[PDB]
Amino acid sequence: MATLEKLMKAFESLKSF
């Protein structure tokens, strides 16, 4: 299900900080 598909870039962009 591509519902929270953004969490990946979100999170990795979060991993960033």
Rosetta silent file (secondary structure, phi, psi, omega in degrees, C-alpha in Angstrom):
SEQUENCE: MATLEKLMKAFESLKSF
SCORE:     score description
SCORE:     0.000 S_00000001
   1 L     0.000  116.985  179.571    0.000    0.000    0.000 S_00000001
   2 L   -83.821   61.648 -179.983    1.637    3.293   -1.069 S_00000001
   3 L   -92.982  -60.875  178.734    0.016    5.228    1.795 S_00000001
   4 L   -96.360   27.811  179.702    2.995    6.369    3.890 S_00000001
   5 L   -48.049  -30.215 -179.627    5.425    5.903    0.946 S_00000001
   6 H   -67.130  -34.538  179.637    6.763    9.388    1.829 S_00000001
   7 H   -43.497  -29.445 -179.323    7.914    8.220    5.283 S_00000001
   8 H   -67.205  -61.450  178.057   10.922    6.772    3.457 S_00000001
   9 H   -64.741  -35.794  177.187   12.235   10.044    1.985 S_00000001
  10 H   -55.150  -59.069 -177.120   10.685   11.769    5.023 S_00000001
  11 H   -63.612  -49.619 -177.983   12.554    9.599    7.379 S_00000001
  12 H   -60.914  -40.496  175.677   15.782    9.360    5.579 S_00000001
  13 H   -63.305  -17.699  178.545   15.573   13.181    5.259 S_00000001
  14 H   -87.875  -43.124  176.085   14.915   12.927    9.034 S_00000001
  15 H   -47.587  -45.103  176.770   17.830   10.568    9.562 S_00000001
  16 H   -37.808  -57.620 -179.774   19.742   13.521    8.129 S_00000001
  17 L  -101.416    0.000    0.000   19.056   15.564   11.280 S_00000001
